[PDB]
Design an enzyme around this catalytic site. Sequence first.
Site, PDB file in Angstrom:
ATOM      1  N   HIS A  60     -23.130  10.067 -18.496  1.00  0.00           N
ATOM      2  CA  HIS A  60     -22.506  11.135 -17.769  1.00  0.00           C
ATOM      3  C   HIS A  60     -23.304  12.414 -17.936  1.00  0.00           C
ATOM      4  CE1 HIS A  60     -20.571  11.843 -21.708  1.00  0.00           C
ATOM      5  NE2 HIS A  60     -19.972  12.934 -21.269  1.00  0.00           N
ATOM      6  N   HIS A  62     -22.890  15.431 -18.940  1.00  0.00           N
ATOM      7  CA  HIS A  62     -22.609  16.520 -19.892  1.00  0.00           C
ATOM      8  C   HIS A  62     -23.872  16.728 -20.704  1.00  0.00           C
ATOM      9  CE1 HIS A  62     -17.937  16.510 -19.976  1.00  0.00           C
ATOM     10  NE2 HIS A  62     -18.407  17.375 -19.092  1.00  0.00           N
ATOM     11  N   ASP A  64     -24.856  17.271 -23.788  1.00  0.00           N
ATOM     12  CA  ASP A  64     -25.043  16.512 -25.044  1.00  0.00           C
ATOM     13  C   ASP A  64     -25.432  15.047 -24.828  1.00  0.00           C
ATOM     14  OD1 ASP A  64     -22.168  16.636 -24.201  1.00  0.00           O
ATOM     15  OD2 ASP A  64     -21.811  15.409 -25.976  1.00  0.00           O
ATOM     16  N   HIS A  65     -25.491  14.623 -23.567  1.00  0.00           N
ATOM     17  CA  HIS A  65     -25.950  13.304 -23.170  1.00  0.00           C
ATOM     18  C   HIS A  65     -27.229  13.267 -22.339  1.00  0.00           C
ATOM     19  CE1 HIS A  65     -22.103  11.631 -24.799  1.00  0.00           C
ATOM     20  NE2 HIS A  65     -21.742  12.874 -24.545  1.00  0.00           N
ATOM     21  N   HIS A 158     -13.126  10.494 -17.702  1.00  0.00           N
ATOM     22  CA  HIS A 158     -13.536  11.578 -18.602  1.00  0.00           C
ATOM     23  C   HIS A 158     -13.332  12.899 -17.844  1.00  0.00           C
ATOM     24  CE1 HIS A 158     -15.529  13.515 -21.941  1.00  0.00           C
ATOM     25  NE2 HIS A 158     -16.671  13.714 -21.309  1.00  0.00           N
ATOM     26  N   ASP A 179     -18.482   8.906 -23.066  1.00  0.00           N
ATOM     27  CA  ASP A 179     -17.253   9.648 -23.395  1.00  0.00           C
ATOM     28  C   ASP A 179     -16.163   9.245 -22.425  1.00  0.00           C
ATOM     29  OD1 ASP A 179     -19.090  11.039 -25.033  1.00  0.00           O
ATOM     30  OD2 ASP A 179     -18.658  12.976 -24.093  1.00  0.00           O
ATOM     31  N   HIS A 239     -19.872   9.491 -31.644  1.00  0.00           N
ATOM     32  CA  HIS A 239     -19.501  10.733 -30.947  1.00  0.00           C
ATOM     33  C   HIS A 239     -18.362  11.431 -31.662  1.00  0.00           C
ATOM     34  CE1 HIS A 239     -18.277  13.391 -27.533  1.00  0.00           C
ATOM     35  NE2 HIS A 239     -19.531  13.238 -27.161  1.00  0.00           N
TER      36      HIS A 239
HETATM   37 ZN   LIG Z   1     -18.581  14.498 -22.252  1.00  0.00          ZN
HETATM   38 ZN   LIG Z   2     -20.099  14.169 -25.237  1.00  0.00          ZN
END
Ligand SMILES: [Zn+2]
Ligand SMILES: [Zn+2]
Lengths: 259, 259
Positions: A60, A62, A64-65, A158, A179, A239
Site C-alpha cells: 500500500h 503509505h 513507511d511501506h 485499511h 496493514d 509492524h
Molecule cells: Zn498503513
Molecule cells: Zn504502516
Amino acid sequence: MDVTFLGTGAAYPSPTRGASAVVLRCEGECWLFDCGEGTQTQLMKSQLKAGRITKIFITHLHGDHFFGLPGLLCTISLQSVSKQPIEIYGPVGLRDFIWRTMELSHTELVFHYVVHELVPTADQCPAQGRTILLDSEENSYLLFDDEQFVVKAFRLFHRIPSFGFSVVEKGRKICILGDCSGVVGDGGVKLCFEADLLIHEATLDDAQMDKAKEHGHSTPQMAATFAKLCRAKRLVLTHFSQRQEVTLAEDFMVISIPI
Amino acid sequence: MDVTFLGTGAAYPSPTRGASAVVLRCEGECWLFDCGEGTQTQLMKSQLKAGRITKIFITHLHGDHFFGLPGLLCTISLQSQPIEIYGPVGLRDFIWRTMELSHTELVFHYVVHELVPTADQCPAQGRTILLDSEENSYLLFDDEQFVVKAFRLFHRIPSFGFSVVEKKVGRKICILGDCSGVVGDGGVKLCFEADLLIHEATLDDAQMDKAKEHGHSTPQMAATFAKLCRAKRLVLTHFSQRYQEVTLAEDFMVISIPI
Ligand SMILES: [Zn+2]
Ligand SMILES: [Zn+2]
Ligand code: NA
Ligand SMILES: [Zn+2]
Ligand SMILES: [Zn+2]
C-alpha cells in the site's frame, strides 16, 4: 526458502525497528516485500545483497511501506546488461511516482525496471508495465504464474487500500499481508489456506482494539483469529507500534520454511 | 550556536555514514541542511528533536540530499509556525505530489521557496527566487537576527551553497552542496571570513580527475577554497562510502561556534 525481516516497526523507522520491509529468498533470488525509508541501509547490515533483488511488492502507498524505494533503486544501480528487468508490483500511482522521482533526481538507472500496478476497489477503505485487475470470481489478482511459483494478491481493508500477497511454490505457501483491520470477503481465507508462513501486522495490543480498527490496524487477537481461520502453520506478527507457533518479529530475524 | 552532523557520507546512506544532513541550531531553533534517506532516524538517535526544525534547505536534487524529506515531514507531523523549505526548482511539486500519493495530511503548514538555477551550473505561498545579477546570489531571508543567502555551485546537476550571517557581523556559517567548484564570484564573496565552512571532499586528492568528472571535490580543492575565502575553520564531509584548521566530519559530531 527463507524470510529475513528488515523492518518490523509501524508508521515510521526508528533506531530499534526499521520501517516495513521483508525479503523472501529462494535459491539466491530475493524478493522484497515493502520498502520503507531505511530499507537500503537495513539490507546493507543484513547478509542479503540489494543487487540480488529481482522483484519488489508494495502492499500500500503509505510512506513507511515505499518511501525507501527510490533510494533502494538508485543504490542498486550505483553499485551494479542485467537481461531481465526488476519487476515492481504495487498500487496504482506507484509507476508515476518512481518515474518522476528518477527524472527529478537525474538518475539514469543502469538496469531496466517495470512497474505492474494493482487496481484497488473503493470498499478497501472507508467512505511494458501492466494494469492488473481483480478477478471477481477468484477474488484475487494474478501477478505471475511460471514453472516455479504462482503469486497472487488479494484485497485488504485499511485507511487506504492495501494488499496481501500469496506466494505458492509449484509446495510451500507464504502469505504476507499489508496493514489492515480486515480482509474484503473470503479473499484471504481462500488464498492463505494452510499457509506455511503467514506474516500479519499487529500494530497495537488487544486492549487497544478500538483504536487499532480506527486506524485500519489489527491486534494480535485479530491476527490470530485470521490465522486460525486459514489454518496457517506459522504466524509471524510485525509492524509494531514504535516505543500454531506465533513469533513476534524483530529486525534481522530469519525464518526458514523447510521442504 | 552549534552544528550537528547527521550524515557525512557520499551518494547513499550506509551503516557507518548517513546520507547528507547537517543541523544548525540557534537558541533551540533548528535549521536542517539537506535531507538524505535516513535523516529522520539519525535525528532520533541524536540529541536533537525533529519537532524543533523550523527551516529546511536543500542544496541540490540528488537523492542522497532529499529522498529523506517526505519521511521527515510525515514523522514531524505524526509526533506533533509554518516550516519553510528552500531548494531547487522541482522540489515543491515533489513534496506536494508525494504527500498526496501517500494520503498524508500534515498537521503543520509548510511553504517551499524555489531557487532557479542557471544553465552554467552543470555540464552542457511559495516564492520563485531568481539570481540577483548585481550580487550574484539569491536572497532567502533578511530579518533582525539573520541574513541567509544562496549562491551557485557547479555539479553534475545544479547545486547551491548557503551563507548564514548572524547580526550583531556576528557569526557566519557557510554550507556548500556537492560541487567541483563555485560559479563566478557570488560564492567567494559570501563565504569571506566564514567562522565555519562545510565543504565536500568525496574522494582523495589522487582521484581528483575522477572527482571532477562527477562534479565533486577532493581535500586539496576544498582547502584551496577555504584559504581563498579566509575561512576560520573548514569541515570536510560527504566522504566516499567504504564499498587553517581542518576537521573531518563524522555522524553525530557537534561543533559549537563561539561568539
Ligand atoms: Zn498503513
Ligand atoms: Zn504502516
Ligand atoms: Na548486506
Ligand atoms: Zn551527494
Ligand atoms: Zn550530488
